[PDB]
Structures are given as C-alpha cells and as structure tokens.
C-alpha cells in the first residue's frame, strides 16, 4: 500500500497543490468572494477535492503562529464511508488492493449521500446537488499506478508533501517527527495507524482544523 | 499509460512568471499538431525538480484560454467599439503612423549643434515578458527608428540594484544562484517576501535549515514567509539603513569580520584623501545651491604611479576601514531599536546569528527584492548589504552572496538587451550628445596602473565595435556609430525614464506609444493621471495576450469614448509555451525552451510581429524616402529570419557573435563564419560581430549551450549544486561571481567542505574561475577599476557610505543620527485628511497587474477580490469588522476593498505617536473579473526624485473608512 506523509512544519501556503489538483482533473472553479480571509474556496465541495485552510493564532512577541492545512481524504485503512454505502449498494465505494486508495464510483448516485458524509470521521465527502454523485480526493490513483507521484505531491515546492510505500513513509514520519520536535516540541502525527495520509502537526491538531484528527 | 497524455507530444519549457526559472513539461495533442492538453513540472529540472507554485501550475489555463485575443483589433478616433482587422491592415497602418511621426519629428542636431539623430515624439514601454532574442531585436528596431524613450519594468525593481552592486563588486547582477541557498548557514530575508514571490526558492531555503541554518525575516508585516522563519523581526517602513548600520557597528565593535578577507580582498586598506569628511549628515563637497556633491572631494590618495595608496596594517587614520568604524559608531543598539521599532533583544539575536557567518567556514546570504527600495536612498540600502557581506567574507562563497532577487522571468535578459533609456546591450551606455565620435565614447573608460588589477572593462571597445558590426556589418564601426540616436548631455538622465514619460505624455508631448507586453493603465503609479494622459496620444499600440485596461483605457471608468481621439491598435501575441527562445533567470541561467502547441487562433510570437512591422517601415522608406533613412535601410535583419519568419536560433547565434573574416586572436586561428567561443576573442577592428558581449560563449561551434539539459557534476560541483552542464549562465558559465575571493592566496578554499573553486595541480577546479591567473597574482574583483570589493564607494550620488535619510516624510520631523532629515541630493503634501501609511504588495496567486492571472479561474478562485489588510488597533479605531467593505482614499484617487483584520499588521511607534499601516494588493483592475476591484495605483503618487525616477508605491498617505 501507498501513503502520504504531510509535514505541515514546511508549508508556505503557496496553494500549488490546490491548483495542481484541478489542472490534472480539469476541474471547474467555484464562484468565490473575499469575506475577510485569504482562504478560498472556504470549504471542500463536489468540484473542490483540496483546499488550504488558514488559521491565525496569537503568540507572545511580534507576529503570529499561522497554521496552514491542505485538506484531503485520509484514505482510511478501515474506511467508514465504505462501511456505510455498502448498506445501500456495494460497488459505490471500493478499495484498491495495490495502492490502498479508497475510491468513489458512479454508483454513489444510488446510495444515501448525506449518510455517507456523516459516517466519515474527517467530514470529507461532498455531494453533487444535481447528479447526487459523491466526490473527494482519489489519491491520483491512475497516476500512482503508472509510476507517477500524485499531482499535489509533485507540485509541492517545500517538501511538505511526501508519497511512497507505507513502510518508507512511516519510517520517514518517525524520523522527521524527532527532528521537527527540536523546533516545535508539541509536534504530533495524526492518527498514524488508521490512515494513509499522515499529517505532522506543529501543535494541537484541532488548532489547524476541527476535523484535523478523528 | 495515462489516457490524458497518450497520443500527445511532450516538450520542455520554462515558467513564464517569476525569475526562479522553473522547468515545465508540456503535452500537446495530435503528436504536436493540436492544442496543449496538460502542463506540469519538469521532474528532471535541477531548480524545481517538478515543483510548481499556483502560477506555474496553472499555465495550462493561461494558454488554453477562450478569453485570449484571436486577431488584431482596431479602435478609430472617438469610437466606442473595437473593429476586427487583418494583420496586413494593422502592421501596414502602424508602419505609416511610425513613419509619419518620425519624418515630422526627427532631429539630426540638437539646439547646441551636436548630432543626435533621434525622434522624441514616440516612446516605448516593455517588456521583461519577451524572450531574450525578441528583447534584443526589439531594442535595435526602436533605436534604428531613432527612439531614446525606451523603458520597461526594470526601471522600478531592477535599476537600484545595478549601480549599488556595481559600485561594490563591479557588476550589477545577483551574485549567486537559487540552488546555492541550500549551502548557507544563515539566511537574512529583508525587503523580500520570497515564500510568496519566489516560491520554489523556499525549497532551497528550507534545505539550508535542514542542515542547521537560521532563517531570519525582517519585514513590516508578518507574511507566509515569516511563518516558516526561525526569527521574525518587525521593522518600521524606511528604517532599513539604521538596521543595517547597527549591524556594521556590531560587526566592528565585536571583531566578527573576516580579517584576512577584509585586508586582502576589500578596499579596507586604501587611503582616502584629506578632502573627505562627514559632519551633521553631510559629506564634504556639498553644493547647497544645486543639491549635489563634488565627488572629487572623496577621491583616494594616489601613489607615484596613479594607484590608490594602501596600508596593509590598517593603522593609517584615513584607511577606509578606520573611516568606516568612525562613520557607523553613531548606530548604537538603543538609537537603532527606537527608530526601527525592533526590540534591543531581537536586534542582538539577529546581529549575533548573522555576524557569526564572519567565520571563514560559515556563510551568510542576504535575499532582497523590490519591496524596500522604492525611494531615493534605495541604492544606499543595497550598498549597506554589500558592505556587511564584504566585512564577513560572504562574497564569492557558496551559501553567501547578495541574492538580489529579479522579478520577472526575463527581467535580467530584457535589461541585458538594453531596454532602458541609458543602456545599449551589454551595459554599454547610450551615447550622449558630447560623445561625438566612437573614439571619444571609448575614451571615458577608467584605466588602472596596478598590474594586479585586471580591470576588464578596458575591453569595452571590442564590445561596442562588435555590437555595431552586428547591426551594420557592411559599415566601419566608427561610421555605424552615427546611425544610432544620442541623448542630450545637458539633461538629467531621469528625463528619459518611466515616470517622466508619463509626465510628458500628460503634457501632450508624445504622438505615439508602444505598450508592448505591459499594462501601464494599471502598473503606473497615479493611474487616474496616466489613464487621462493616454487620451492625449494620437496612436497607441498594445501588444498583449488579452484585452486589458491599457488597450481599452478609452472606455474605462468615467471615460467617454466620443471625447477621446486616440487611435488604438491591439495586436494579440502568443503565450510562452507556443514559441521557442531563451529566458535569463535571476542567477543568470540562460535557458532554452521549445514550442509545444501552435499559436492560438491568429496570435503571433513577438519576434514575428516586430519584424513584420519593421519590414513595412523599411518598404515605405524605400519607396517614399523620408527623414535620414540610413539607420533603417542598412540594419541587418537578414540574420534574424529563416523560412520567412523570426528565427530565435539565428538571433541567438548573432547575439553570441561570429567572425566576419579569418582572424588571429589570443594566439588562436579562426576561420570566417565560425562562432565566437567567448567574449575574450572579440576584437575592435571589425573582425568580429556580437549583438551582446555577455552572450559570447552561449552558442558556439559546439552548439546551443543554453539548451543543455545535462546534470553531470563532479563531487565538488555537486556538493554545492553548480550544475555547470545545465543550460548556460553569463559570464562564460561562472555560476558564482567573484569566486576568486573564496580562496586564500595559495588557492585553497576558506571552506573546503563547500569549495567553489580550488587550485589543484596547475588549474582551477569546480566553478569556472572568475578571472584567469595563478593564485595570489590578481585582485579578485576583476570588473572593478582598482580590483577590490568597495566598502567605501565614492561614485555614489548620496556619498561613499550609506547614511540614514528619512524616506517617510509625513510622520517624521527629526533624524536621530544627524541634523539632515531628508536625502540632501533629492514635494509631499501630507494632507491631514489622510493619516495612514498605505503600502502595496503581492500575493502568491496573482501576477503583477493581474492582467494574466485575473483571466485564470483557479487563481481568481483563491483570491477573487481586492482586499485591505489592517491591524485590530485600526479596525477598532475606525469601527471596521473583518470582511466589511471599506473605502481607501488619497489625494490621487479612491477605491473599495474587502477588509482583512489581522494581527499580521501592527502599528508603528514613530516619534512617540502610533502610526497605522494599511496594506493593499496591486493585482486588480476594472476590466476583469466581476467585482474584483480596480488598481491600487489609483491611490499612489507620481512625484519621483531626480536620481532614481521611482514613484513611492510602498509608503503613501491614505484614509480608510467603513462603507455599508
Ligand atoms: N506571487 C508573485 N510573485 C512575484 C510577483 C507577483 O506579482 N506575484 N512579481 C514579481 C516582480 S516583477 C517583482 S519586482 C518581485 C518583487 O518581490 P518582493 O520585493 O518580495 O515584493 P513585495 O511583496 O512588493 O514586497 C516584499 C516585502 O517588502 C516589504 N516591505 C515594505 N516596505 C518595506 C520597508 O521599508 N522595509 C522592508 N525591509 N521591507 C519592506 C513588504 O511588506 C513585503 O512583504 O516579485 C516577483 N514575484
Ligand atoms: N503600486 C505598485 N505598482 C507597481 C509595483 C508595485 O509593487 N506596486 N510593481 C512594479 C513592478 S516591479 C513591475 S514588474 C511592474 C509590472 O507592470 P506590467 O508589466 O505592466 O504588468 P502586467 O502587464 O500585469 O505584466 C504581465 C504582462 O506580460 C504580458 N505578456 C506575457 N507573456 C507575453 C509575451 O510572450 N509577449 C508579450 N508581448 N507580452 C507578454 C501580459 O499580457 C501582461 O501584459 O509594475 C510596477 N508597478
Ligand atoms: S504545495 Fe506544498 S507548500 Fe504549497 S500549500 Fe501545498 S503543501 Fe503547502
Ligand atoms: S477520510 Fe472519510 S471519505 Fe476518505 S476514506 Fe476515510 S472515511 Fe472515507
Ligand atoms: S492526491 Fe490527487 S486527487 Fe488527491 S488532493 Fe492530491 S492532486 Fe488532488
Ligand atoms: S512563478 Fe516562479 S516559483 Fe512559481 S512556478 Fe513559475 S518560476 Fe517557479
Ligand atoms: S520586473
Ligand atoms: W518587477
């Protein structure tokens, strides 16, 4: 199986990943407006599989702690979205044996979309108001099967985004956590045993986003 | 197989946005015979390794964009609509407007009776966005037509760097390169927001941190850069020289300078003449009438042979080093902390971290861009950085340098090709009216009598002659010299620059303007004035990707098309990935890129547009005659084309240069037609041509070195990441400039673990040595007259040492360092109705005026509207909530924006009073998108200064009010 390691201690919020995801799949842009934040789109949607969340936290001295969170499906080892949906119809949500990708299919139009979102501990699935299909991050599974990095990983300039075989990436996450703690002592890995997208947070994960961790 | 990329042809390209120079891979349908289907990063490129920021990553949406121009448009006087027209009509009628204006305006001799052979009724803006071969051909077209008002982007962001660093080191360029940042032990980012504005640079900055480096950001605002640095130090607007002067004092007081480096490789030991002095904020030789210095008062004491005297013991009181100590003793931590608003504790931390790189085996680098230098002392800011780097021995070494970050993908190149009013290609000055002959021109170059001083600029006659042979190969250089226009020696140089072109335009003194690859209706300070001023043109040519606020100024806000008589031609050019050519990145890497998809609809490359346009002028002159036809008719354009179109390859070969006959040079035989292998083999006797001497070496008989994609490195090359077989950098593939300073006088590196060059058994190993010669036999700064890195720099208008002169006018009345408040060699109103300091800056997702990126849905998606960033303090004072609509106003204009209330902005304490800063992006404009907002340059002033000619876009007075 494959895995992402996302070292949020290196993120510049360039939003290369957000754009590259849409370029590869030729996704449409949403209608957005500025409501007092650089964050946009404000949320994941049927047409937005990844958005970078921005959070400002006061600190003592000059400046802030500026927290950035490029959100995506965690590609859970034991996916609750699939456990749901398999109630209505098997084949709506499948798991790739080789990569470990969790994949939504066209049959998601036939299941209870709203229910499948609720089952997700990370609040990831989004519904098309018209066709009722569910969408989310698909791990760029076709790229991965063809020996390419996922679009968001390849584009990333800082080394925030990492991808590879699960043992290499777990070994990398443990090694990096130790190094990162020398600068950020309260650094933690997010649900490292449950998921295939392992975020390193510089502090309390919920500071980055309320569903940062399960 | 991936279906999306199956059946598509794969070509390489280079990003069309910033000067990092990231590599792309382009997939084009029908095995190259259709449209682009995908654009992403080139995994093999050594700078980005496949990475792209959102601008680069969205180039597919830029190129395959249905809002792009499809064909020429024409707008008749007083009309209120565009009329589509053929290329034939457009280029024909433009050639006639050029000829009609030239014939009526041309002046062979000025009033004083000197030959000038020019027209002053036409001006040109642009552009750093064109390929290097296009920039070169464009400048030579404009000058063959007799123009002198030739400017582009470089005036604003590049032009301060060139004399600051030239004075200091002998060249104006960024000293190191992007990959080299990874070798630094301490990175000081000051006057730069590199994480947002040069994003792939942070790949290498963070790798420096991984190996133990300290990252420091010094900025008035907390940015996405600041978020990833070890130390964020706030600084008050315009307080940079106090900051840097305190660091110089700290270095001297604590003896953290690199003693051997300073003694041997800087001008520390040189004896300054007794006529030098400084008192109460004024140097000696001040003329209070003319607001100017007599700089001969700053001259060195010369020995019997005309060489500046030296005390290697550094004990003589008039040694540069002793005068330096004296000058900066006023910059104590207490005074500096008060004015900068940086706490003493943080100053000490920053000074300690950075001055530690004064160790021989530690390296510190400074990264700056345009942010901090938009005023009259910007040159002296950069001088201070250079001086610090020289004291610490950081110039010439891996992980060191002054990394003056270039803005646009080819601003280095566009400047290199002389698209500013004062320079020809290769930084040969444009002659003034008193340089009556070529011999007089060549007479101005200073000579050295020091045998250890290479003084390379003595070769200038070879370069000027070779240039003239490139344009006019059937003429003797001395004769060809008379074809090209000359500026008036009487006038101040700034009369020919950006800001004054707008001033003259407003007085109705221009007939025609080229707006070639620029959007001045948004990019020029004081937009309301410029928009009105453009209505006093007779014709306007806009060459551009899309319709924009410049092309269509005549139907802009408040404008009545029926009252505006300007005739406008819009010519749609093609995007970067639809053409072949080179771009020179910030580190001087000259990188070749290839055509992927064919031009969209009936768009053309700039090379074809300009060449076709010139040919029509050439035809008109051949059949009608007219004003002094010779410069046009004799210009060598046959070297510029192949198979009936502009040829990037052939122009590049001409720019490199070739022998016009069998020639012996430097004890080598050369046959006629051979490519010149380096600028060392150029001649002044007509044997050689070369369009740009800097390019000599880039395209030899061995082929196009700019197109090399070879990652082969020796161990010592790979350790610091020189990549010498990847593309080509001027000069002659020297990746790190001044590298002779990186070794002792036996040729042993100061830091063996990060060697740049090394003397290994008879030769230099590593980088290409910057100046030939055995160890210990040459001074290391070969482009300097005297050979030394200049701590003391007496060629600068403001004085030989940087000194704090307040660039903020309105909130300040006293200078704590002297009795001289403002720059004494340089009319702000300060109307009390505008109490806040407005500033403009960039975000990661948009480009320049936003002309390009406001057309890309994914970038608008992330940043859809103009905003105004303010502190919680100012929000409370004005009763503004996060996300409210606010009105920002000044003496010059007004606009609306969305408020962003953030702790990332804080008040400044200036002379006991809280002063609030107000931040705007300058990426917006009325044409597109819906509800985006208009340019922040509605608010900015256009009163520059007679030295720089730069408007103040970083500190200008505004008010902010809530709207409902
Ligand atoms: N995303 C993006 N990148 C770009 C561009 C773009 O439009 N968008 N444009 C490119 C071009 S053409 C250029 S010239 C470069 C310019 O690149 P930068 O110079 O980095 O650009 P800015 O954001 O205008 O200014 C940089 C910083 O200077 C700070 N600053 C303002 N006043 C002062 C001062 O008095 N002192 C100090 N120390 N800092 C101060 C601002 O707060 C800001 O954070 O960027 C290039 N790269
Ligand atoms: N208030 C304020 N004003 C500023 C600045 C600031 O910081 N604040 N920054 C200043 C600086 S440093 C700069 S660089 C200027 C920039 O000002 P401009 O250069 O006028 O800005 P844009 O036109 O947005 O720059 C991109 C242009 O490149 C064109 N282009 C792209 N590719 C090609 C091509 O192949 N051929 C041709 N012919 N055109 C092409 C696009 O059509 C577009 O017009 O703005 C300056 N003005
Ligand atoms: S591309 Fe990398 S650095 Fe940029 S926002 Fe995404 S994860 Fe962060
Ligand atoms: S994060 Fe949610 S949508 Fe993604 S696999 Fe897990 S349960 Fe399913
Ligand atoms: S892995 Fe692919 S689908 Fe998932 S966020 Fe990244 S680019 Fe988008
Ligand atoms: S804009 Fe600059 S950093 Fe971003 S992809 Fe292009 S060259 Fe690289
Ligand atoms: S630029
Ligand atoms: W610029």
Author numbering:
A (entry chain B): 2 to 215
B (entry chain A): 36 to 861, 869 to 1006
The authors write:
A similar approach was employed to gain further insight into the structural changes occurring when the formate-reduced enzyme is exposed to O2, thus rendering it inactivated. Since the formate-reduced enzyme is more sensitive to O2, formate-treated DvFdhAB crystals were first prepared in the anaerobic chamber (<0.1 ppm of O2). Thus, in the current work, the non-activated enzyme (C845–C872 disulfide bond oxidized) was used to slow down the catalytic reaction, aiming at trapping putative intermediates. The formate-reduced DvFdhAB crystals were flash cooled in liquid nitrogen at different time points after exposure to atmospheric O2.
In this context, the highly active, efficient, and selective metal-dependent Formate Dehydrogenases (Fdh) are very appealing systems that enable harnessing millions of years of natural evolution. Additionally, the oxygen sensitivity of these enzymes must also be understood as it poses an important obstacle for biotechnological applications.
